[PDB]
Amino acid sequence: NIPSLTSFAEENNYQYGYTYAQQQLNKQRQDFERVRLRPEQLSNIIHDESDTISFRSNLLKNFISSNDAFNMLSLTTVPCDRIEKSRLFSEKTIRYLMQKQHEMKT
Amino acid sequence: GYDINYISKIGEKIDSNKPIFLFAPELGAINLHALSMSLQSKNLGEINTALNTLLVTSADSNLKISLVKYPELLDSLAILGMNLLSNLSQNVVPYHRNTSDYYYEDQHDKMVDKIFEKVNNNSPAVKQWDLLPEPIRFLPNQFPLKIHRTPYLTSLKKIKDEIDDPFTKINTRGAEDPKVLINDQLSTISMILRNISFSDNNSRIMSRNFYLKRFISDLLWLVLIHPENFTCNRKILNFKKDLVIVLSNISHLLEIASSIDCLLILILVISFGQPKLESLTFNEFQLQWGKYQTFGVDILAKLFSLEKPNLNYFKSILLNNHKDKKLLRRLLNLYNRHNLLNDVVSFLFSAIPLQQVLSQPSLLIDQFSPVISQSLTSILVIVQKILPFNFNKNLPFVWLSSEENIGSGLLKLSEIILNINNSKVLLPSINISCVQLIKCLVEKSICFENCLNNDPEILKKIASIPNLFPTDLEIFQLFTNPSVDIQIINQYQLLYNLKNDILTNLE
Amino acid sequence: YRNFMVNSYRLNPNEYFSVTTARRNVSGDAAALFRLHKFLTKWGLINYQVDSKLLPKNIEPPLTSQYSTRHDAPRGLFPFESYKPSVQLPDMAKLKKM
Amino acid sequence: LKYAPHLPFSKSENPVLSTIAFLVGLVNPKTVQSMTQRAIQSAESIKSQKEEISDQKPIEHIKEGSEIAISSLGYRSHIFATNEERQMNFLTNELIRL
Amino acid sequence: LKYAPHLPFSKSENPVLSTIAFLVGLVNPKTVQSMTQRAIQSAESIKSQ
Amino acid sequence: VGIDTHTATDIYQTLIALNLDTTVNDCLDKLLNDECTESTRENALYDYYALQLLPLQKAVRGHVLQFEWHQNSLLTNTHPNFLSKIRNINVQ
Amino acid sequence: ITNTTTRVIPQVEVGNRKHYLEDKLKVYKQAMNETSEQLVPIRLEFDQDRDRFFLRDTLLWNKNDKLIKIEDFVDDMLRDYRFEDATREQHIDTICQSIQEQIQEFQGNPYIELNQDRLGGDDLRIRIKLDIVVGQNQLIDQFEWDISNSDNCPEEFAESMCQELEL
Amino acid sequence: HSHPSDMVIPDHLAELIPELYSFQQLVDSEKRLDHFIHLRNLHMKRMVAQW
Amino acid sequence: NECIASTSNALKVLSGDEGYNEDMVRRANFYKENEAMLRENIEVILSNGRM
């Protein structure tokens, strides 16, 4: 097949109305461009991450994540002088930067 | 105060069984003429119930919507999408105006009626208007300030950070805001137009439709230059995600109208893919993410096939009727010489998965042969018919030696493809495309050096590519096996004759 | 011209109001009268009920019928609510005071 | 607040005032004296403040107390925001080491 | 009460949030912003010392 | 503390019904007793006419609003994932 | 009828005629370059000899009109005359070629309209005779008509005469 | 669930914490290192097959 | 105020209910600012014969 560019012309094709070579080329045209342009009627209809995203699950997760983070704010009756600060380094990041600074003189 | 996991578990079933709109089996005899006349009715319900009944049928894949039997539905869709793009950039609200909506409700005697205004107390001009408004450019509001080149993955992260926001407005509904009503009419228009274009007759009817080409050149301006009017950030991605699909099916017969559209096509196709932080400015897109960039390398492969207006517009854009001269020269220097050419060629060197098919052997090339073939065709068109003087930087040299060594990747890919078929249709074209691309890149590097004449020591630097230029032993192998072709070994032997002429001219 | 064509169709709606009778009965060129008649019949309004057919009979399932509505039905839309009266004795005193 | 239920004439629970007292009982009272001029600051500044808060309506005390409570909530939210920023810096250092 | 059929507030679950929901209508936001920024700057003046 | 929104809404319904019935019976008595003036008898007779057909007006105000909401059907405001049609790169 | 088994029916037609689909761009390309009209009197006569149809209809036609294809209008007219679908061996091409010839011979309103226009015209009064048959009535009347005046409206005089006679 | 989206620290965190650029161009500095191993492996598959 | 108005609205969508705000459409100034769409919808419902 792989019919033509002349078979795609408007003269050899039907229009809103109101030969043999044309009716032979339009067989191969409709038999080529209906196995090429047909959509996939099976799975892999996900196509990406941002099509199977769920508004209901994210809305439920945000309803939980706002409620518990607001219960963290108001109901935690620890005064501001008593809120102890967290460490800016870990127990492993403080070992690796003692190791690499020891090995930095090479 | 509630246990909202159980409440949402029940409300999912409630939303599933809720009577929102008709399903596919209960639509009855869909009459295309009734839909096409209701879209021109400028009502609100008659437009929306036509759009929904078109969206259900067009996505059904069992009910065909052919435009041979009725070609004026598409003009109604495109004129509606034109007139919605017009009053979105000006923030006019249709469908509920407080204007009257009606026009003039109501010889030798016109001088007698003129003096009748004298003796009772005792020639109208012409009109001019058009069918469609100006596109969306040549408007006083619309002047470019920033080409919104956001990539694919940053758009995905912006979507996932807008949905997972506490104070989100992504579900503010339709009747609570008119701007989201205009946006959800335009998204329905785009979903319909990407659903219609999967037929053999619609793809050639939509190709020869001045209304559809004007609507495409009208939306592609708005989604790239001024996307501030679209409410959500998922609608802006979804317009690009179905404009590329509707341009993938049309472009084999599309004749590009204006040069601004031919630039915005390039920017839209470039906007899929991931750049870096000269050299190749595009990291390779690994296809465990999504095949949406593979649609762009077919738009660029089919729109380069006409030397009529298409390739002339692409040439005048990549190398360099009275206001768009000012618009094109404003858009080209807003895009941050020859950044466009190396961006397009580096993106087309992406989506050829050299690293993935050469890491692990026949399945991946049998799956990705069409995208590889059309990408190599597009790069061959750009190399042979665009690159031959206003350059100031050697582009084929910084493609050949960009620390990724794509020439060695193409040569190993030609080895791989030559070692499967002789030990599944496009592969004899892909072999000759790879070898001719390497040959044309080396020859154009030497020709660009002869034209520019600033870097004399490149004959060493061309011959110092670690896996270019196949040895005489594999060509000795290729001249003995009967399972090889004639043009394959012809391209290989002229690549070797180029290799010998490197070393002769080296000293 | 438009009022003539619309008034002339609606005297006998079973008849296709042709272009030729409209051309023979008002004075004007055939092109503009043909274009106006085709625009008019494009939007209904004339020749809309030339060959009318009868819908035979509808075997109606329940809840798809006139007067098939109950007070027990859920008001998904129809946003006005019916609210539960709270009869609590301190709230009774509050209602008596307020 | 008119439409709030209560225990009438007995069993006085004070949701507004205990909410205000609970919100102000977390926020370091010297900076509460820095927050408003109305609060008691010294034993020499009781009489002038008591004179200057006079001739006010009963709604004014509700307004000022609720303003102080919401401002203390905002201050506590700022402290929690800075602690979360410290947490993000800790996660950044963990990422860099990994 | 403006959000009539959907009230996601519980005295046991959020005692503070319901009273704050009833209280935010009365206050002026400008003085609230002024007092919380004065609290922030006073805390910075203490912490810098 | 300060949470009861719900009982407040219910007794608000009760108090609204109380004040509405107070005004209805006021206009009813002022129209039924002719010891009241006709400018609050016949005025209140037609107040009572307005106090007779008000929730039928709200019923049409609900169904017409429901149909106006039905006009807002676009099928992309609803499920925003309506996957329409795709096709990957073919050998054709 | 909508209550069916969910087919797609494009343009269910009335009077056995597909709906006329306009161009909407040539309409504006013609309606804005719209200097004059130049109506053409067109005569159609056919007999049972040398033709099969009779078709004695007379119509006006705009000569400057480039919108409507003339074969489409003739094909609509033959469908309006209730000719059955064998209407090409009793050709639409014969009537289309007759109407194509009759608008080519129309030399237009001459230099009385083209070059000059004397207000009031000239003394060229011609003796118009007419003989019209409708149903079983025959209108026979003669009058005088200035052919040298441009602002003589035939339609405004025809409506005036049929007003008085109640035609 | 290999999400390609959440490998990006796009703007809002990198403006607040400046070390994230020092993280991100770290990762890119890894991504051209492993690729240098990859062109190494296709080198070592070549020369042995050459010999 | 954005934390409350996006919490009850977060309950209305998860429950499955829809429609206008009940306390907004209960007054009379709603049907005076929306005077345009009501003259359309009343004629549409009356002419179709559903009013």
Curated annotation (Swiss-Prot), chain A:
A single MF term (Gene Ontology): rDNA binding
Keywords for this protein: Activator, Nucleus, Phosphoprotein, Transcription, Transcription regulation
Keyword Kinase set for record: no
Biological processes, Gene Ontology terms: chromatin remodeling; maturation of LSU-rRNA; nucleotide-excision repair; positive regulation of transcription by RNA polymerase I; positive regulation of transcription by RNA polymerase II; regulation of transcription by RNA polymerase II
Localization, UniProt: Nucleus
GO-annotated cellular components: chromatin; cytosol; nucleus; SWI/SNF complex
Broad class of where this protein is predominantly found: nucleus
Role summary: Involved in transcriptional activation. Component of the SWI/SNF complex, an ATP-dependent chromatin remodeling complex, which is required for the positive and negative regulation of gene expression of a large number of genes. It changes chromatin structure by altering DNA-histone contacts within a nucleosome, leading eventually to a change in nucleosome position, thus facilitating or repressing binding of gene-specific transcription factors.
Other noteworthy facts: Present with 2900 molecules/cell in log phase SD medium.
Subunit structure as annotated in this protein's UniProt entry: Component of the SWI/SNF global transcription activator complex. The 1.14 MDa SWI/SNF complex is composed of 11 different subunits: one copy each of SWI1, SNF2/SWI2, SNF5, SNF12/SWP73, ARP7/SWP61, ARP9/SWP59; two copies each of SWI3, SNF6, SNF11, SWP82; and three copies of TAF14/SWP29.
Name assigned to this protein: Transcription regulatory protein SNF6
Gene name as annotated: SNF6
From Swiss-Prot, chain B:
Zinc finger C4-type: from-to: 434-451
UniProt subcellular location: Nucleus
Additional note from the record: [SWI+] is the prion form of SWI1. [SWI+] is the result of a conformational change of the cellular SWI1 protein that becomes self-propagating and infectious. This conformational change generates a form of SWI1 that assembles into amyloid fibrils. [SWI+]-aggregates sequester soluble SWI1, resulting in reduced growth on carbon sources other than glucose, reminiscent of a partial loss of function of the SWI/SNF chromatin-remodeling complex. [SWI+] can be cured by GdnHCl and by deletion of the molecular chaperone HSP104, which is required for [SWI+] propagation. Present with 92 molecules/cell in log phase SD medium.
Protein family: Belongs to the SWI1 family.
Domain comment (free text): The prion domain (PrD) is a Gln/Asn (Q/N)-rich domain, which is unstructured in its native, soluble form, and which forms a parallel in-register beta-sheet in its amyloid form. The first 37 residues of this domain are sufficient for aggregation, propagation, and transmission of the [SWI+] prion.
Description of how the protein assembles with itself and partners: Component of the SWI/SNF global transcription activator complex. The 1.14 MDa SWI/SNF complex is composed of 11 different subunits: one copy each of SWI1, SNF2/SWI2, SNF5, SNF12/SWP73, ARP7/SWP61, ARP9/SWP59; two copies each of SWI3, SNF6, SNF11, SWP82; and three copies of TAF14/SWP29.
Recorded name of the encoding gene: SWI1
UniProtKB/Swiss-Prot annotation, chain E:
Subcellular location: Nucleus
Protein name as it appears in the record: SWI/SNF complex subunit SWI3
Function as written in the Swiss-Prot or TrEMBL entry: Involved in transcriptional activation. Component of the SWI/SNF complex, an ATP-dependent chromatin-remodeling complex, which is required for the positive and negative regulation of gene expression of a large number of genes. It changes chromatin structure by altering DNA-histone contacts within a nucleosome, leading eventually to a change in nucleosome position, thus facilitating or repressing binding of gene-specific transcription factors.
Subunit-structure text: Interacts with RTT102, SWP82 and the N-terminus of SNF2. Component of the SWI/SNF global transcription activator complex. The 1.14 MDa SWI/SNF complex is composed of 11 different subunits: one copy each of SWI1, SNF2/SWI2, SNF5, SNF12/SWP73, ARP7/SWP61, ARP9/SWP59; two copies each of SWI3, SNF6, SNF11, SWP82; and three copies of TAF14/SWP29.
Gene field: SWI3
Source superkingdom: Eukaryota
Covered residues, full protein: 592 to 640 of 825
General remark: Present with 3150 molecules/cell in log phase SD medium.
Swiss-Prot record, chain F:
Note: Present with 217 molecules/cell in log phase SD medium.
Subunit (UniProt): Component of the SWI/SNF global transcription activator complex. The 1.14 MDa SWI/SNF complex is composed of 11 different subunits: one copy each of SWI1, SNF2/SWI2, SNF5, SNF12/SWP73, ARP7/SWP61, ARP9/SWP59; two copies each of SWI3, SNF6, SNF11, SWP82; and three copies of TAF14/SWP29.
Protein name as annotated: Transcription regulatory protein SNF2
Placement of covalent cross-link Glycyl lysine isopeptide (Lys-Gly) (interchain with G-Cter in ubiquitin): 58
Subcellular localization: Nucleus
Gene name of the encoded protein: SNF2
Its biological purpose: Involved in transcriptional activation. Catalytic component of the SWI/SNF complex, an ATP-dependent chromatin-remodeling complex, which is required for the positive and negative regulation of gene expression of a large number of genes. It changes chromatin structure by altering DNA-histone contacts within a nucleosome, leading eventually to a change in nucleosome position, thus facilitating or repressing binding of gene-specific transcription factors.
Species per Swiss-Prot/TrEMBL record: Saccharomyces cerevisiae (strain ATCC 204508 / S288c) (Baker's yeast)
